[PDB]
Amino acid sequence: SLYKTFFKRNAVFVGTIFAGAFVFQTVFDTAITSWYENHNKGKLWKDVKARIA
Amino acid sequence: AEHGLHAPAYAWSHNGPFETFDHASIRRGYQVYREVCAACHSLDRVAWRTLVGVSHTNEEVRNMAEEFEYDDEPDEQGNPKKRPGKLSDYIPGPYPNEQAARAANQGALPPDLSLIVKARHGGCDYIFSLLTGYPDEPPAGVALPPGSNYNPYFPGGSIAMARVLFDDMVEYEDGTPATTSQMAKDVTTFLNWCAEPEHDERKRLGLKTVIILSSLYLLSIWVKKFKWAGIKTRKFVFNPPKPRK
Amino acid sequence: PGPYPNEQAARAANQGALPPDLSLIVKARHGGCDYIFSLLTGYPDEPPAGV
Amino acid sequence: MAFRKSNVYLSLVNSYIIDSPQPSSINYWWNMGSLLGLCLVIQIVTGIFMAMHYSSNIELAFSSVEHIMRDVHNGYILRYLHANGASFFFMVMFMHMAKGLYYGSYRSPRVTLWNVGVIIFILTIATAFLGYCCVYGQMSHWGATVITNLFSAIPFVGNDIVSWLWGGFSVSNPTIQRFFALHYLVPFIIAAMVIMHLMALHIHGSSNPLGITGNLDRIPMHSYFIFKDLVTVFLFMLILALFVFYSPNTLGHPDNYIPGNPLVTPASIVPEWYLLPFYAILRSIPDKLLGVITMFAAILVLLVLPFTDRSVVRGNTFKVLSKFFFFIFVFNFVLLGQIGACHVEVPYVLMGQIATFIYFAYFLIIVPVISTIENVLFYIGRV
Amino acid sequence: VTLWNVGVIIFILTIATAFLGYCCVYGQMSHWGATVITNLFSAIPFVGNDIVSWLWGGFSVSNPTIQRFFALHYLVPFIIAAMVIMHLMALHIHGSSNPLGITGNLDRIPMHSYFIFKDLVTVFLFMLILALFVFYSPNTLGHPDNYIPGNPLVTPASIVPEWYL
Amino acid sequence: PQSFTSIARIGDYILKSPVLSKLCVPVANQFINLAGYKKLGLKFDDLIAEENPIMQTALRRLPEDESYARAYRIIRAHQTELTHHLLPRNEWIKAQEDVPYLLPYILEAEAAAKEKDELDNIEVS
Amino acid sequence: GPPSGKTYMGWWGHMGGPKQKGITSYAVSPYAQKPLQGIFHNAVFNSFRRFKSQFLYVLIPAGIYWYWWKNGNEYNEFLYSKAGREELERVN
Amino acid sequence: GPPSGKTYMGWWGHMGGPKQKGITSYAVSPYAQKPLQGIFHNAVFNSFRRFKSQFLYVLIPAGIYWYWWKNGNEYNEFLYSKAGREELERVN
Amino acid sequence: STVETFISSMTATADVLAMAKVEVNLAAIPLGKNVVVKWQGKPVFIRHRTPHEIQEANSVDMSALKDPQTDADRVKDPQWLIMLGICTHLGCVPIGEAGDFGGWFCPCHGSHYDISGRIRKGPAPLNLEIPAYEFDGDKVIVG
Numbered sequence A: 001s002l003y004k005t006f007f008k009r010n011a012v013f014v015g016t017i018f019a020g021a022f023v024f025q026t027v028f029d030t031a032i033t034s035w036y037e038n039h040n041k042g043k044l045w046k047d048v049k050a051r052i053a
Numbered sequence B: 001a002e003h004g005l006h007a008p009a010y011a012w013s014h015n016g017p018f019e020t021f022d023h024a025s026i027r028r029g030y031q032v033y034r035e036v037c038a039a040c041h042s043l044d045r046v047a048w049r050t051l052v053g054v055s056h057t058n059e060e061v062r063n064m065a066e067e068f069e070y071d072d073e074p075d076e077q078g079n080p081k082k083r084p085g086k087l088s089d090y091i092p093g094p095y096p097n098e099q100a101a102r103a104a105n106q107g108a109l110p111p112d113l114s115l116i117v118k119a120r121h122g123g124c125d126y127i128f129s130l131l132t133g134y135p136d137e138p139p140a141g142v143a144l145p146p147g148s149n150y151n152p153y154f155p156g157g158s159i160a161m162a163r164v165l166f167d168d169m170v171e172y173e174d175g176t177p178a179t180t181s182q183m184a185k186d187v188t189t190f191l192n193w194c195a196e197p198e199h200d201e202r203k204r205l206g207l208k209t210v211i212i213l214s215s216l217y218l219l220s221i222w223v224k225k226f227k228w229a230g231i232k233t234r235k236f237v238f239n240p241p242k243p244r245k
Numbered sequence C: 001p002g003p004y005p006n007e008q009a010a011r012a013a014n015q016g017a018l019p020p021d022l023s024l025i026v027k028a029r030h031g032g033c034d035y036i037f038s039l040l041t042g043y044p045d046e047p048p049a050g051v
Numbered sequence D: 001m002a003f004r005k006s007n008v009y010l011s012l013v014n015s016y017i018i019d020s021p022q023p024s025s026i027n028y029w030w031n032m033g034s035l036l037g038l039c040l041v042i043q044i045v046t047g048i049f050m051a052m053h054y055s056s057n058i059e060l061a062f063s064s065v066e067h068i069m070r071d072v073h074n075g076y077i078l079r080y081l082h083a084n085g086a087s088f089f090f091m092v093m094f095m096h097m098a099k100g101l102y103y104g105s106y107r108s109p110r111v112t113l114w115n116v117g118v119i120i121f122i123l124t125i126a127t128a129f130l131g132y133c134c135v136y137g138q139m140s141h142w143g144a145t146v147i148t149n150l151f152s153a154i155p156f157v158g159n160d161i162v163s164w165l166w167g168g169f170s171v172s173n174p175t176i177q178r179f180f181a182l183h184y185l186v187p188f189i190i191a192a193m194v195i196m197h198l199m200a201l202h203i204h205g206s207s208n209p210l211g212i213t214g215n216l217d218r219i220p221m222h223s224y225f226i227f228k229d230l231v232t233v234f235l236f237m238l239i240l241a242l243f244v245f246y247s248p249n250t251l252g253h254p255d256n257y258i259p260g261n262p263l264v265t266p267a268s269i270v271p272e273w274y275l276l277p278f279y280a281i282l283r284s285i286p287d288k289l290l291g292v293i294t295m296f297a298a299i300l301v302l303l304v305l306p307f308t309d310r311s312v313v314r315g316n317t318f319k320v321l322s323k324f325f326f327f328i329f330v331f332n333f334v335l336l337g338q339i340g341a342c343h344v345e346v347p348y349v350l351m352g353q354i355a356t357f358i359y360f361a362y363f364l365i366i367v368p369v370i371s372t373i374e375n376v377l378f379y380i381g382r383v
Numbered sequence E: 001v002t003l004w005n006v007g008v009i010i011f012i013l014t015i016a017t018a019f020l021g022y023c024c025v026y027g028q029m030s031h032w033g034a035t036v037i038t039n040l041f042s043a044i045p046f047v048g049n050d051i052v053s054w055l056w057g058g059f060s061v062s063n064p065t066i067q068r069f070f071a072l073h074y075l076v077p078f079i080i081a082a083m084v085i086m087h088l089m090a091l092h093i094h095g096s097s098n099p100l101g102i103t104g105n106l107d108r109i110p111m112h113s114y115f116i117f118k119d120l121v122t123v124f125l126f127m128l129i130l131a132l133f134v135f136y137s138p139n140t141l142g143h144p145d146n147y148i149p150g151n152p153l154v155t156p157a158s159i160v161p162e163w164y165l
Numbered sequence F: 001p002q003s004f005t006s007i008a009r010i011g012d013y014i015l016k017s018p019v020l021s022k023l024c025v026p027v028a029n030q031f032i033n034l035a036g037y038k039k040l041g042l043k044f045d046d047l048i049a050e051e052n053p054i055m056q057t058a059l060r061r062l063p064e065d066e067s068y069a070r071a072y073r074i075i076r077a078h079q080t081e082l083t084h085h086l087l088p089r090n091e092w093i094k095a096q097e098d099v100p101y102l103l104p105y106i107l108e109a110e111a112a113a114k115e116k117d118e119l120d121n122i123e124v125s
Numbered sequence G, H: 001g002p003p004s005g006k007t008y009m010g011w012w013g014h015m016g017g018p019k020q021k022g023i024t025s026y027a028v029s030p031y032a033q034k035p036l037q038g039i040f041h042n043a044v045f046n047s048f049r050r051f052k053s054q055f056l057y058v059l060i061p062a063g064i065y066w067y068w069w070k071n072g073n074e075y076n077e078f079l080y081s082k083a084g085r086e087e088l089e090r091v092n
Numbered sequence I: 001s002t003v004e005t006f007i008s009s010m011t012a013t014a015d016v017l018a019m020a021k022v023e024v025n026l027a028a029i030p031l032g033k034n035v036v037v038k039w040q041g042k043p044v045f046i047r048h049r050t051p052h053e054i055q056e057a058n059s060v061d062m063s064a065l066k067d068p069q070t071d072a073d074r075v076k077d078p079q080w081l082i083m084l085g086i087c088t089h090l091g092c093v094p095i096g097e098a099g100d101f102g103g104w105f106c107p108c109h110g111s112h113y114d115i116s117g118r119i120r121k122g123p124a125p126l127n128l129e130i131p132a133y134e135f136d137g138d139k140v141i142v143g
């Protein structure tokens, strides 16, 4: 079952809590950062410095 | 008349929960500061290094801070000597002591604008409407004291700051027209950056915090109801015991 | 007021040595009052043989 | 027995937050107390980490708060979370002080729990006022002068106390440098009074909105009111996050961003929104000595409230007129803080006298007489 | 045993509190007493160099160090005062011991009027010997080198700690 | 704090006076149902605070049956209140079931405690 | 330990209420029932019920202090207006 | 209140010692007797008694570490003396 | 995230991070002069050197010095000598250009220091530390 592998042992239940929270730190950070720069395209510094060409 | 005319709400590009500064306007606003309002106002709380990666490039900022001079530690026999500025130093104001400022400007003390945006009620709307809110003549009925100019938005009416914004007094490095309305929109943007150099990072860390906390707040309601489910639907019955005992 | 404006000008007049501020010298040199007195009168006319 | 009950240190935690028997029908108005405990920790923790970068000299006091905001890693988060948490601290406390007055929480056998709250109420006003002068803004210099020069009305002794409190002849370096060292001390006194506050809460327990005995139906504190308190913690930290990241300077005043100047006064010396109403009580009396007595009495009038209430029912829930005049008094205070925002001009002075009169008369005339007929309407309506 | 272990925790926090308040004066002995003690954690492998730089707030003992040493020095006594409360809580479950090392439950007398007035005997003797060291010889226990302003360039002749460390 | 005998001598006089019992009693009866305790199943005397030695004395003299029922209406009101709802309309308290079942016990306990305080301060001539 | 005072609460076992008898309770495990079962029909019909009961206790008390502040604000506006200085001098 | 653990002390009334019987105590009010009654003959004869008992427990333990530090101090004085540098170089 | 923000505030601020690198000129440092600069709160004994003492540094045997390192490893361009001022024994300041090997002589405990910075005569445990420095044209940024 899915229960027998994950939720039965509190040792491995909190392990996958920390393992999933490890991935979420970097995936969520990049997902929010990219949309924020995309919504503000043409205004950020890397766009003004790129305009100097 | 003595509260000062209320200034309306304009269409600033950085209002709203997701907007950043237009970093092209911070680069242009810095240019019209250096040549217009650099003579009578100070910016004492801005270091040189904060301009790198925001408005100018690193080689551009290491040359702007070298046009000025700073006082160096004494030489081998204690005599004083000067040094060129580096990226760790601050922007120098135009006047050495508070007395010399009041001498050039008829006794009025021109304030330091490193915090003016958060220190005059009217936010960004009050600085913009100040420099463009000057009538050609005072309203009928009022005779101003000598040396003072009229401006309705100023609380009390009479002010000691003149008109400094005309047309084509500055040339830009990207061909933008230099109108009185154009620059006044730019300095307020550059000055808001000086008062809040954390502006963009604050608004993107906020989006991360709100999304995390708003789903934590919703998940907590389900968990609260799951654990309170046994008491919400608990049912009582009452049957009177016999009075024999 | 002291005699020198900056720490560099003190070391120039006295061959590089830094003369200390004596507003606290009594409690800052072991030997208390006995060490300042025996300092200015404890100079032999010539150094001991060997030095 | 279990280790959580046998150990000397874990048995105190057990009997206060784990096995404590709570009434089974207290609503969300009883969550306010834990929110003040959360906010007390926020002020202290965000203050110790921000006290590592602050200089209390009159020369460096203002300049150091900018260094915190511009140079310290996440230094703006520290100062907005501490400046806005002070304002959020009072809003929860008023909703804690108002829920107590509505459900009749002040009545016996909880009068000591009511008086310790008033002591806590004063020390927090001083703590917020003291930390306000630490910034040494233009509003804080003149908020310091006006409040401290208030004791010059005590006869024959006032002029020496004022000179003793200032540490000199006015607000200068000796004043700010001792205001900060006091501001670091008082929160440790509030934390000690909260311990004495929860000690008087534990002898008889919390009350319930019905105003009747709660010993018939109790549920444990853990897993019921630990997870229900988690609902408001996340909502409090979400509204606080909106005021910190999206509009940090809405509640404050822009004149506090000017360095304090002893020569030029601001256009309008106004206190913060939580001390605003008592500022109108002070300014209603056309005398100097009488203002202080009237201003401080408004806090002390709450103390006679367990005696004026002549009702045999706790609360306003089953009372039509006692629930009716409560909201006028609520609003009169809301109106009382409105005049203090406006200048001293016609006709705000006349409003300032009648409004503060109805404020004081609620405790001394309306609550005792309406509570009296209500005992009679209850009696002949059933007979 | 718990009353014994809480004492050791109290023992350490007082050493830190006295050491932290010693660097507050910023004397010549306090600068170099700060450098030697804080650079002691550079012996923990692979992690020491970051902790030392994190503790100093920079690359050495400078303004960021003293300004955070004082704010800590004001905090720790309030932690000791809280540990003393926990220290007297573990003393109250079983009580004090007696020099005979045997049971003391057979003969007890109240604390008031017996050990309140016997404690007054040592309070006046403690405040008398302390008054002799404060009015007649204030600088006997300390070190004269602490009256020099701290200098980062020149080391003292002998870096020595206070007589208790 | 305004006692109960004090506010009852006010009652029996208004009841007997024809002008008063016609003017205010027809106004008092709307004050009871507007209060709205009847809808949660509460008799009035269950609303009075009981944390004083006078009410604790009367609660002990109360018979077993009226003390068992009193326990159930308080439990039902606590349970119904936490659900943010009300009782069904067919279980509410009517006008006639709301009787003064706790009245005489409160009155016989204050007149025996008024006597005690009036005997502790007798100035014999 | 030392004796303590007399309070109005006990603990688990001697809470201090009246003796109860003849009252029965039923409950069901939350693992066996569906939460969020009636959130709709409670966000609409239940909220409207409570609002209609307690809304004249808050409105009229707020309906008096809104007209009182407005007739003072729009009176202060005329007293300091160009057309209302003559009334200003008789109240100043 | 909540139950507590098991300790080795009680309070006034249940202190927790063994049951005692057949032991009698006499005392006299201090208003009726003279303090300072035997301070002499206690400052001389009693103190000498206690000293003669516990003084070889402190002296010999202090008699070992005084000769150990002195023969090191007067040895360090010769090793750094003009006559003891030749022994210094063989220990340095 | 919360713990990281509070602990991070304790870490070095922008201005202290800025004072990290100091450059020194390639012409202003004289031949027979000892620059004692306070870099990062630490002394540094700079000495622009002569081309004669390079053979003098590696002249002695490796038995007269307990940390084996030649002159070319302790300084890259032999026209300089940039040494960390903290002595390996206690941290004293040796006297400048006075001693027996052309370098330094610690007066606290008699540890002789050469023109390369090693110990020669003394109980000091290591040769004296050399900081990080890199030439960039007319300057060299120590640290």
Ligand code: HEC
Pocket (backbone or CB within 6 Å): B033, B036, B037, B038, B039, B040, B041, B105, B108, B109, B110, B111, B113, B116, B120, B127, B159, B160, B161, B162, B164, B187, B191
């Ligand atoms: C000609 C000199 C001069 C120049 C150029 C100048 N100002 Fe001023 N400014 C003054 C003086 C003088 C005052 C003080 C007047 C007083 O407060 O009455 C002042 C006051 C101000 C104030 C304070 C107003 C308030 O309500 O107290 C602001 C804001 C301000 N200036 C902004 C600016 C900005 C923004 C610029 C250009 C970007 C600028 N100034 C350029 C002279 C100048």
Ligand code: HEM
Pocket (backbone or CB within 6 Å): D040, D043, D044, D045, D046, D047, D048, D050, D051, D054, D065, D079, D082, D083, D086, D089, D127, D128, D131, D132, D134, D135, D183, D184, D187
């Ligand atoms: C209940 C407890 C406290 C309250 C209500 C409180 C409130 C305040 C307030 C209102 C300010 C002014 C905020 C502003 O407008 O900028 C302030 C400033 C300050 N507080 Fe506190 N404070 C508390 C506890 C503490 C503690 C425990 C410390 C330190 C250990 C502390 C340190 C400071 C410092 C350094 C400032 C000035 C820094 C700044 O605001 O820019 N506070 N406090």
Ligand code: HEM
Pocket (backbone or CB within 6 Å): D029, D030, D031, D032, D033, D034, D036, D037, D040, D093, D096, D097, D100, D105, D106, D113, D114, D116, D117, D118, D120, D121, D194, D197, D201, D205, D206, D207, D208
């Ligand atoms: C930091 C400040 C404070 C904290 C942490 C605090 C905490 C608490 C807590 C946890 C409770 C029990 C839970 C509850 O009733 O909601 C409580 C009850 C109470 N507090 Fe406070 N409190 C504080 C300040 C005050 C103040 C300022 C007052 C009054 C001016 C006050 C008056 C009361 C009253 C009357 C109760 C009893 C409420 C009841 O049982 O129904 N408290 N407090």
Ligand code: HEM
Pocket (backbone or CB within 6 Å): E003, E004, E006, E007, E008, E010, E011, E084, E087, E091, E095, E096, E097, E098
């Ligand atoms: C401010 C610091 C301290 C205070 C105020 C304090 C206070 C007390 C008090 C009042 C007692 C009971 C009376 C007595 O036995 O004399 C006691 C007992 C004791 N303390 Fe402390 N103490 C402190 C620090 C320490 C430290 C640092 C240690 C150990 C390193 C310690 C270990 C003990 C022990 C073992 C006892 C039991 C003694 C006995 O019952 O015979 N205490 N303490």
Ligand SMILES: COc1c(O)c(C)c(C/C=C(\C)CC/C=C(\C)CC/C=C(\C)CC/C=C(\C)CC/C=C(\C)CCC=C(C)C)c(O)c1OC
Pocket (backbone or CB within 6 Å): D016, D017, D020, D033, D034, D035, D037, D038, D040, D041, D044, D045, D048, D049, D191, D194, D195, D198, D201, D206, D225, D229
């Ligand atoms: C009646 O029902 C109850 C109830 O009984 C209770 C107890 C609570 C819970 C509430 C509380 C107990 C609130 C208690 C609040 C306090 C006592 C404030 C806490 C104050 C402090 C912790 C003191 C300050 C000390 C520190 C935090 C020091 C921290 C250390 C630092 C910052 C040093 C860091 C430095 C280094 C070197 C890392 C309830 O919420 C509740 O209703 C649900």
Ligand SMILES: CCCCCCCCCCCCCCC(=O)O[C@H](COC(=O)CCCCCCCCCCCC)COP(=O)(O)O
Pocket (backbone or CB within 6 Å): D034, D035, D037, D038, D223, D226, D227, D229, D230, D233
């Ligand atoms: C004084 C400041 C806070 C006021 C008190 C408010 C109470 C909230 C405390 C949060 C603890 C809740 C978890 C209880 C627990 O251990 O349950 C444990 C395990 O539960 C869990 O799964 C834990 C969920 C994780 C959520 C914790 C987030 C903390 C948010 C910060 C709150 C304080 C800043 C016991 O579970 P049980 O119900 O089986 O007994």
Ligand code: FES
Pocket (backbone or CB within 6 Å): I087, I088, I089, I090, I091, I092, I093, I106, I108, I109, I110, I111, I124
């Ligand atoms: S410091 Fe180098 S030997 Fe003493």
